[PDB]
Amino acid sequence: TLKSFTVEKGIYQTSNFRVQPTESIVRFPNITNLCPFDEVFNATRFASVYAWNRKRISNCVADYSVLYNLAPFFTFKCYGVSPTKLNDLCFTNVYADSFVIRGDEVRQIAPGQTGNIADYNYKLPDDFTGCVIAWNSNKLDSKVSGNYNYLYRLFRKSNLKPFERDISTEIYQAGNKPCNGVAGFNCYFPLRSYSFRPTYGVGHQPYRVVVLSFELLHAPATVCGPKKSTNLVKNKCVNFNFNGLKGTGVLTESNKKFLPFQQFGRDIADTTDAVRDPQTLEILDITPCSFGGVSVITPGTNTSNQVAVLYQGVNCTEVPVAIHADQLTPTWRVYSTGSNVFQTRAGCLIGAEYVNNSYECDIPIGAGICASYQTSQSIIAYTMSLGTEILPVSMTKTSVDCTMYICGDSTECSNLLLQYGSFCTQLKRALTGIAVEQDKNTQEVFIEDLLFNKVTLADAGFIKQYGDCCAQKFKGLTVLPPLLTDMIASLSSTASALGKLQDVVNHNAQALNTLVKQLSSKFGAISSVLNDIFSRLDPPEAEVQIDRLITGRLQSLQTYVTQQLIRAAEIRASANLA
Amino acid sequence: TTRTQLPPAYTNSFTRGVYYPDKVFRSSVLHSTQDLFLPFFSNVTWFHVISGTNGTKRFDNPVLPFNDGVYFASIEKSNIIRGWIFGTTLDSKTQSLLIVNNATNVVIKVCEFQFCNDPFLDHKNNKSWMESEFRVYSSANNCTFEYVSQPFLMDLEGKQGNFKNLREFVFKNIDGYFKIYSKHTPIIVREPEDLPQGFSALEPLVDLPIGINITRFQTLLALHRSYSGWTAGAAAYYVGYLQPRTFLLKYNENGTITDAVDCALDPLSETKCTLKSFTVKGIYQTSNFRVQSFGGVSVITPGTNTSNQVAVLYQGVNCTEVPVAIHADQLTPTWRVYSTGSNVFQTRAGCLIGAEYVNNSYECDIPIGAGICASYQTSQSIIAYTMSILPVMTKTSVDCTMYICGDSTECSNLLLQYGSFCTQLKRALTGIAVEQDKNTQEVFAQVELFVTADAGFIKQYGDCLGARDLICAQKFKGLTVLPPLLTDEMIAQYTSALLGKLQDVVNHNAQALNTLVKQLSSKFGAISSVLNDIFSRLDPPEAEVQIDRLITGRLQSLQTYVTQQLIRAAEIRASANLATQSAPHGVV
Numbered sequence A: 001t002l003k004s005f006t007v008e009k010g011i012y013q014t015s016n017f018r019v020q021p022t023e024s025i026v027r028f029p030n031i032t033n034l035c036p037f038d039e040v041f042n043a044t045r046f047a048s049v050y051a052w053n054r055k056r057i058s059n060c061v062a063d064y065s066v067l068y069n070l071a072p073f074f075t076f077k078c079y080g081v082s083p084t085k086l087n088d089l090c091f092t093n094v095y096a097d098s099f100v101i102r103g104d105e106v107r108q109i110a111p112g113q114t115g116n117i118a119d120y121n122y123k124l125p126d127d128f129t130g131c132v133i134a135w136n137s138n139k140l141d142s143k144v145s146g147n148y149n150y151l152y153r154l155f156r157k158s159n160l161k162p163f164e165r166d167i168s169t170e171i172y173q174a175g176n177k178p179c180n181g182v183a184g185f186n187c188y189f190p191l192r193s194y195s196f197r198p199t200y201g202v203g204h205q206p207y208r209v210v211v212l213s214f215e216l217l218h219a220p221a222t223v224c225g226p227k228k229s230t231n232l233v234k235n236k237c238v239n240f241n242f243n244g245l246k247g248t249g250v251l252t253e254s255n256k257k258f259l260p261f262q263q264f265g266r267d268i269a270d271t272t273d274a275v276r277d278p279q280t281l282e283i284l285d286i287t288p289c290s291f292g293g294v295s296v297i298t299p300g301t302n303t304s305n306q307v308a309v310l311y312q313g314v315n316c317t318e319v320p321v322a323i324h325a326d327q328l329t330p331t332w333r334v335y336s337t338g339s340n341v342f343q344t345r346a347g348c349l350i351g352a353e354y355v356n357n358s359y360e361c362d363i364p365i366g367a368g369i370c371a372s373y374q375t376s377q378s379i380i381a382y383t384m385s386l387g388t389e390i391l392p393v394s395m396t397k398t399s400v401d402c403t404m405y406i407c408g409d410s411t412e413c414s415n416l417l418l419q420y421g422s423f424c425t426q427l428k429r430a431l432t433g434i435a436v437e438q439d440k441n442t443q444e445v446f447i448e449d450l451l452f453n454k455v456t457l458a459d460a461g462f463i464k465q466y467g468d469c470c471a472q473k474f475k476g477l478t479v480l481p482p483l484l485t486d487m488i489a490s491l492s493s494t495a496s497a498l499g500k501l502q503d504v505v506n507h508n509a510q511a512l513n514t515l516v517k518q519l520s521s522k523f524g525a526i527s528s529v530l531n532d533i534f535s536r537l538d539p540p541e542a543e544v545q546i547d548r549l550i551t552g553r554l555q556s557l558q559t560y561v562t563q564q565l566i567r568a569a570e571i572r573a574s575a576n577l578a
Numbered sequence B: 001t002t003r004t005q006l007p008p009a010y011t012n013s014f015t016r017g018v019y020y021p022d023k024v025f026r027s028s029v030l031h032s033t034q035d036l037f038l039p040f041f042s043n044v045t046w047f048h049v050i051s052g053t054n055g056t057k058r059f060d061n062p063v064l065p066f067n068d069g070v071y072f073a074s075i076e077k078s079n080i081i082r083g084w085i086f087g088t089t090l091d092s093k094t095q096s097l098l099i100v101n102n103a104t105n106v107v108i109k110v111c112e113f114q115f116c117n118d119p120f121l122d123h124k125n126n127k128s129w130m131e132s133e134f135r136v137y138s139s140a141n142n143c144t145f146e147y148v149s150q151p152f153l154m155d156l157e158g159k160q161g162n163f164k165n166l167r168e169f170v171f172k173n174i175d176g177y178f179k180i181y182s183k184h185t186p187i188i189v190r191e192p193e194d195l196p197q198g199f200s201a202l203e204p205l206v207d208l209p210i211g212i213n214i215t216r217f218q219t220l221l222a223l224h225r226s227y228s229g230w231t232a233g234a235a236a237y238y239v240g241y242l243q244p245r246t247f248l249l250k251y252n253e254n255g256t257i258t259d260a261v262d263c264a265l266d267p268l269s270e271t272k273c274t275l276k277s278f279t280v281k282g283i284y285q286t287s288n289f290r291v292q293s294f295g296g297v298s299v300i301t302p303g304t305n306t307s308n309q310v311a312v313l314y315q316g317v318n319c320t321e322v323p324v325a326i327h328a329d330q331l332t333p334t335w336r337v338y339s340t341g342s343n344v345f346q347t348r349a350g351c352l353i354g355a356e357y358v359n360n361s362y363e364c365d366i367p368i369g370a371g372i373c374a375s376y377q378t379s380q381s382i383i384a385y386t387m388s389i390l391p392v393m394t395k396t397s398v399d400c401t402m403y404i405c406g407d408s409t410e411c412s413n414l415l416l417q418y419g420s421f422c423t424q425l426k427r428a429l430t431g432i433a434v435e436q437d438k439n440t441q442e443v444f445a446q447v448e449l450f451v452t453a454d455a456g457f458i459k460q461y462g463d464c465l466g467a468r469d470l471i472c473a474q475k476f477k478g479l480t481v482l483p484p485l486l487t488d489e490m491i492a493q494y495t496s497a498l499l500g501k502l503q504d505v506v507n508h509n510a511q512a513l514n515t516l517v518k519q520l521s522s523k524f525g526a527i528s529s530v531l532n533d534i535f536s537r538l539d540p541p542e543a544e545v546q547i548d549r550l551i552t553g554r555l556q557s558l559q560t561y562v563t564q565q566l567i568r569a570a571e572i573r574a575s576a577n578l579a580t581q582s583a584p585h586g587v588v
């Protein structure tokens, strides 16, 4: 995971281990009677548009595929629920309503939008959990036989409170003065205009509307899905589906003193550590099954391939190497028993054996235990036994071209980014500040061939590439040459103590590599390249796609600038020390 | 019955009227919630019912407005109160609720009634059984809701005496739901006929789905006959209107509310809100005031361990434009602000109220500004005047996938579309840990106070399956603490061979960790804060953006935490370099 075919000796981190679930249990309350749905809606002439009835539905099991398989019933544009997943959710306090309307203006008076009837009486929130279903009445039952439905919503002054009828009646209010007798002002009553098909060659179809309201889930549920129930299993990392609170963990007996009305347990930070079974009234504690971190200890790629493994913060007996029935990284088991597993305050050590010697410390393990490679040759762990000068000067000056880096080869990208204010200039100034401050560091602070030779195995610039190539380049990244050129002017062995000056060069290198690789990130868009997106996509969503791309790239480069400032502070302190 | 009018009395509600707002169970947590409640120390009516004029019935049943709730209670001795009928107009043209208490049946009924002007009930059952007791009305039609159960009160009879019932009821109606909360308790003395200053949790009793429009509050009485006319014993009930508020509750071990605090009553109350604790000495910033000019408000207190006296500083406003009277309004005025009886003094910062400016000078304790400081001194009051160990922190690590995506493989798949945006976080945390290890080696390797807020835990192994502490709760979601390399014993051996400055770092780390773990509850503009519910209710095409918004929010939170950790690490390393006896994560 280090992207290398050789690895120096040390302790490293690769991934984490977790215990997978082995089976599934589902508990749901039992309701013998099937939930009536044809009776509640498929019935005689529906409730009036002005005074629509409401029917509470409770304590029933409903299957909604019957509406699918029977008749057209167009619309059915659910607003906040998956139409297919309706049979997988257990409901609460569901309401049904009977509606009558012409249908010519049904689109405007549709839920979530303003319409004539919608602005007259019936008001809905910005979004509702239920679904709107319009029963498109076909001919010979669409009042083709004759007109009926005396009531109509001819007039209404303004909208009303949410979920309210239109029992308001009486003649229209004359503009000159409030009207009572309709004598000189044509003040009409607000209804009586239904005329379905008396002489209409082309007209409207009855659109009886039903809408639901649900998803509380805090109180005990009443309407619940037709999903079956099985016996429950305790003391195992299993998947549970208690009344809808699906999760993974271990269920155990508990001593919590719930009051009768209380159902769901909670914890310090929004985690259900307790639950009540639907069928049998009993209290259960939930605890996530075991997981932890893994570290690999190696003594050197050239030296030997024998390694050791350290499991972080787990008890050896509970998670040994012989429980590989569901553990992550199944094949990465390290034989059956590599060595005597050892217990440390940090966890479990496998592949090594513990000695009774007090040697000098090496690649370390937590709580004062150091490992070593020693005599045939194997890995040991023990308790540690008590028993020139190099300082950084300044980092490599750098600069970034905002319009080149983000909006490359796209004037339209720059045009759209222009609406983001000026988020490139101030960053340019911020980089320039540390850039010019490095020069004053060098001026304030102020064998050689051997040091120059040793360092130059990993350096940048050299001939500083002032012409043709190189050194990453492109995407508007440049290196500012130092102002003071080389007017500034045991060790020969491989055992070089020059860790400090190599450290800053390395860290800058990985910072630059991370920044340049950030461009390969998709950010969840269709494509990470602007030309392809512009070519084969329309503007309306192209703007939002490029907007998200701009946000991601600017966020990444802001983080890079912040890291540069943080490192520049330390380099400043080190320079002032010297 | 040719009765005369009476003046209703007034009483103080004290610290009563706290009820469980939610069905969940919590323990040892300090939860805060906003809901309708009876404000602490509010005026409550004292409707008193007796056999007036030595046997003349007192029609003390006005048509009280229902409004937004009630705190109906009683200090009743024997069974004399029944009925809480409600209605918009109280006639045959209005749907109305009715609650009788026949023996052991509530008979909660929703029918249109031709209501009696002054309805009552017979506490003594009529002779030959089948007591009529139906003078309350004469006509019933359009019965929608009927409910029968055990009596709404199962209170024991008055028995021999010397003790009385204290039935407490709360009625609430919201969004077509009618909730009835109840609680009972005995009483010791009746000399003032006043509610004792005691907490009272009001458990839920009944919930009804009726969505009837209601605007008025009525009451019934239970008296059989003249034991001329109709007479009974003695009883009394109070009415407390309801308004929205915000409270901080204190769940105990077993999960029962023992005491709560209002959040707008006094300056100390609001300070305890903004600190989320029941104990506070110093200066704190609470809120800001705006005039329908604006400014900020700060509270100066000597410490809850000493006194409840306070003082208020308004920043950037002269004392002229904001006197004490404006507290009757503005939405920043539930305040008392006392008055100008305590002299108001103007400083450079702004307007200070609640302190007296002395003519002396001392070394000051609470810094106000511009050379002015306040202190608690001698009787005793707040007076303002003019003034006259090295840390070395704890290693921490975080897990990307499980924290961002808790037990969801689809969320992991979508996160991998972000690629590697937190491997650098792991590198930064590991480098920081190596940094403190090197600092300890440099400061201690050249050849006992032992404070405990550190405790003697066993590093909190995986055996945490049994409150659940605070470290175990944060152990989940992937926030672990790696153990130090050097144990305390060898540090002591090195020392042998050779306190706020330490507590502040630990407190800062703890509060940062708590903020990070609490940030998960943020909605972030989605419809739910749990991915499982999103999968259950939503299809993938929009669930992906819904999850993406939370992913962006959580990534921002993690990046912020990492930046704060780096900035703190720089300072602690500077201190370690400055530190050129053994203490927990420090030196003396």
Ligand SMILES: *[C@@H]1O[C@H](CO)[C@@H](O[C@@H]2O[C@H](CO)[C@@H](O[C@@H]3O[C@H](CO)[C@@H](O)[C@H](O)[C@@H]3O)[C@H](O)[C@H]2NC(C)=O)[C@H](O)[C@H]1NC(C)=O
Pocket: B102, B103, B104, B105, B107, B148
């Ligand atoms: C106090 O007043 C209530 C007012 O309703 C009385 O309610 C009684 O309730 C029961 C059960 O609902 C009724 O029984 C019903 O009718 C017959 C029995 O007569 C039988 O077919 C069933 O048992 C059916 O549920 C009963 O009729 C009804 N009382 C009257 C007078 O109608 C209650 O009995 C009264 N006394 C108490 C609570 O001690």
Ligand SMILES: *[C@@H]1O[C@H](CO)[C@@H](O[C@@H]2O[C@H](CO)[C@@H](O)[C@H](O)[C@H]2NC(C)=O)[C@H](O)[C@H]1NC(C)=O
Pocket: B001, B116, B117, B118
């Ligand atoms: C309440 O009951 C009725 C009204 O609901 C009234 O009682 C009678 O009211 C009429 C109205 O003129 C009088 O003529 C009768 O003399 C009243 N009868 C009695 C017995 O008082 C009255 O308003 C109220 N009181 C009573 C006792 O009924």
Ligand SMILES: *[C@@H]1O[C@H](CO)[C@@H](O[C@@H]2O[C@H](CO)[C@@H](O)[C@H](O)[C@H]2NC(C)=O)[C@H](O)[C@H]1NC(C)=O
Pocket: B141, B142, B143
């Ligand atoms: C509930 O009250 C309504 C309102 O009076 C009654 O509705 C009446 O029903 C009859 C039956 O055809 C109609 O002729 C009337 O016009 C209706 N009155 C209206 C609409 O105001 C209803 O009957 C009552 N329900 C009962 C008594 O069970």
Ligand SMILES: *[C@@H]1O[C@H](CO)[C@@H](O)[C@H](O)[C@H]1NC(C)=O
Pocket: B088, B213, B214, B215
């Ligand atoms: C309820 O009825 C009253 C009539 O007393 C009316 O004024 C009010 O608008 C109705 N609705 C509500 C929500 O109060």
Ligand SMILES: *[C@@H]1O[C@H](CO)[C@@H](O)[C@H](O)[C@H]1NC(C)=O
Pocket: B252, B253, B254
């Ligand atoms: C909780 O209930 C137990 C069981 O009787 C009791 O001993 C204890 O005092 C109660 N209160 C607390 C705070 O534990």
